[PDB]
Design an enzyme around this catalytic site. Structure first.
Site, PDB file in Angstrom:
ATOM      1  N   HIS A  75      11.981  68.243  32.966  1.00  0.00           N
ATOM      2  CA  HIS A  75      12.379  69.632  32.767  1.00  0.00           C
ATOM      3  C   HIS A  75      11.681  70.258  31.569  1.00  0.00           C
ATOM      4  CE1 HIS A  75      15.535  67.955  29.962  1.00  0.00           C
ATOM      5  NE2 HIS A  75      15.318  69.097  29.334  1.00  0.00           N
ATOM      6  N   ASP A  99      14.247  63.067  36.324  1.00  0.00           N
ATOM      7  CA  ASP A  99      13.887  63.966  35.233  1.00  0.00           C
ATOM      8  C   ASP A  99      12.977  63.259  34.234  1.00  0.00           C
ATOM      9  OD1 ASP A  99      13.727  66.330  33.852  1.00  0.00           O
ATOM     10  OD2 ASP A  99      15.690  66.130  32.865  1.00  0.00           O
ATOM     11  N   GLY A 155      16.371  70.677  22.316  1.00  0.00           N
ATOM     12  CA  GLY A 155      15.046  70.287  21.896  1.00  0.00           C
ATOM     13  C   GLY A 155      14.871  68.811  21.622  1.00  0.00           C
ATOM     14  N   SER A 157      15.657  66.365  24.071  1.00  0.00           N
ATOM     15  CA  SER A 157      15.372  65.619  25.288  1.00  0.00           C
ATOM     16  C   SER A 157      14.018  64.941  25.149  1.00  0.00           C
ATOM     17  CB  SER A 157      15.392  66.531  26.520  1.00  0.00           C
ATOM     18  OG  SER A 157      14.366  67.511  26.477  1.00  0.00           O
TER      19      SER A 157
END
Ligand SMILES: CC(C)(C)OC(=O)N[C@H]1CCCCC/C=C\[C@@H]2C[C@@]2(C(=O)NS(=O)(=O)C2CC2)NC(=O)[C@@H]2C[C@@H](Oc3nc4ccccc4nc3-c3cccs3)CN2C1=O
Ligand SMILES: [Zn+2]
EC number: 3.4.22.-
Length: 198
Positions: A75, A99, A155, A157
């Site tokens: 993502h 993801d 911020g 991830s």
């Protein structure tokens, strides 16, 4: 067709320094250099450490080296190449269902070792170099010992969850929040990475 634009590369813009007794964020590239590097895909900056701060034109997040692969979230990165000294580098792994994406780890990076401890006392490393204790609650979930507004985690991830011995247990993916307060985190378990590595 002749005017169709090209998405830029992901660019390493800094790192979370974990080498000493103090964790701290370091920036290695400013915004103008980042934008130019994203367009060319050519990044001659020296890379160090396990946790990189990465940016696109529109987002900034983290990426973590495990077993010689630099991993982050789909993502954030989509299908983008990453900038490297010799030009853009294509993803070696892409899994939208997890993801998850990965590129070959940059020269100079260091890789974390996948955890084999079976331990549930974990630590999440944020983009602000906070080390947050997390109790593992399932294969892909952990609870914050002290809840935080989701602002605190935005911020991060792509960052690591670590065991007490510093092994990689997972990659931070999503915050579990109620009324804007994060009480838990969802992560990609390192075993899922190791399977993706077939
Ligand atoms: C519902 C559950 C319980 C799972 O919880 C949530 O979904 N909570 C949401 C709350 C979002 C509010 C902000 C939370 C703060 C920090 C968040 C830590 C970060 C983070 O920092 N991002 S970032 O660095 O700012 C950004 C890179 C610049 N993560 C996200 O914001 C994740 C993105 C997206 O999830 C997916 N989006 C996509 C988009 C395209 C293709 C695949 C895809 N697959 C995805 C998944 C498959 C499994 C779990 S997620 C939703 N997120 C969540 O966290
Ligand atoms: Zn371990």
């Amino acid at each position: 067709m002749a005017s169709m634009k090209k998405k830029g590369s992901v660019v390493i813009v800094g790192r979370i320094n974990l080498s000493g007794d103090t964790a701290y964020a370091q920036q290695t590239r400013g915004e103008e250099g980042c934008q130019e590097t994203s367009q060319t895909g050519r990044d001659k900056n020296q890379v160090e450490g396990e946790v990189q701060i990465v940016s696109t034109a529109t987002q900034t997040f983290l990426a973590t080296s495990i077993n010689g692969v630099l991993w982050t979230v789909y993502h954030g990165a989509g299908t983008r190449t990453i900038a490297s000294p010799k030009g853009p580098v294509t993803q070696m792994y892409t899994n939208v269902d997890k993801d998850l994406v990965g590129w070959q780890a940059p020269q100079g990076s260091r890789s974390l070792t996948p955890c084999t401890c079976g331990s549930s006392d974990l630590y999440l490393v944020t983009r602000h170099a906070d080390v947050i204790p997390v109790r593992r609650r399932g294969d892909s979930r952990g609870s914050l010992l002290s809840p935080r507004p989701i602002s605190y985690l935005k911020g991060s991830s792509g960052g690591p969850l670590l065991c007490p011995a510093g092994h990689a247990v997972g990659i931070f993916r999503a915050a579990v929040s109620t009324r804007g307060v994060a009480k838990a985190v969802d992560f990609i378990p390192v075993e899922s990475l190791e399977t993706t590595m077939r």
